[PDB]
């Protein structure tokens, strides 16, 4: 051949049990809003009801984990204390 690849340096991202398509706290969907907001609108305040991303790559509705921090505080899918780093998606 005329051009042959010798080296490569991809960077491979990874996701834990985020289950893209369901939230582990309320079980609704990665979208479709949450149990507290029910319908997509239903007073969602300019769609502020967004997804929250932990340091352990676990994704829930911001609302569903926020309310889980008024009772527990250690991320239900492992044991890590859980942080509030990345947001949205």
């Amino acid at each position: 051949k005329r051009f042959e690849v010798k080296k490569w340096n991809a960077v491979a991202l990874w996701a834990w049990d985020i289950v893209v398509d369901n939230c582990a706290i309320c079980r609704n969907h990665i979208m479709d809003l949450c149990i507290e907001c029910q319908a997509n609108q239903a007073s969602a305040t300019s769609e502020e009801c967004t997804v929250a991303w932990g340091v352990c790559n676990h994704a829930f509705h911001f609302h569903c984990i926020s309310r889980w921090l008024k009772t527990r505080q250690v991320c239900p899918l492992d044991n890590r204390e859980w942080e509030f780093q990345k947001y949205g998606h």
Binding site: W14, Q85, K86
Partner: protein, 130 residues
């Protein structure tokens, strides 16, 4: 500034050194297996989305036989651990060294010209439509 963003900073740096250890680990794994021939010299870095944002859209365009086989091997390895969750399909990051061939001058492609050059290798005389 204080310890409030410097925490995410340590996050990133840790990601870096840990992915360097992961590169040495995968080198021994490729010496034990390395089925896909396309997967040769690989600097696969395992970073967390919790620190590194998505560049624009995280694309999944045609992968080139060498980097395609390479991406398949990497995804199979990454899913051997997290059942299902494999290497995220992306092309907007990284680089490569294209060994061209009067001498053998090695080029460089930043994960963007690999697919077009591979399609040229398969068949030259292409255009925008192809």
């Amino acid at each position: 500034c204080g310890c409030q963003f410097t925490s995410k900073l340590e996050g990133m740096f840790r990601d870096m050194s840990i992915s360097n250890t992961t590169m040495d680990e995968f080198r021994q794994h490729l010496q034990a297996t390395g089925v896909s021939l396309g997967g040769v010299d690989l600097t696969v870095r395992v970073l967390t989305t919790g620190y590194w944002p998505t560049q624009s859209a995280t694309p999944k365009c045609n992968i080139p036989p060498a980097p395609r086989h390479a991406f398949e091997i990497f995804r199979r390895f990454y899913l051997a651990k997290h059942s299902g969750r494999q290497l995220t399909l992306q092309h907007h990051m990284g680089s490569a060294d294209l060994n061209a061939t009067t001498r053998k001058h090695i080029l460089q492609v930043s994960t963007f010209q690999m697919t077009i050059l591979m399609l040229f290798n398969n068949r030259e005389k292409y255009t925008f439509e192809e």
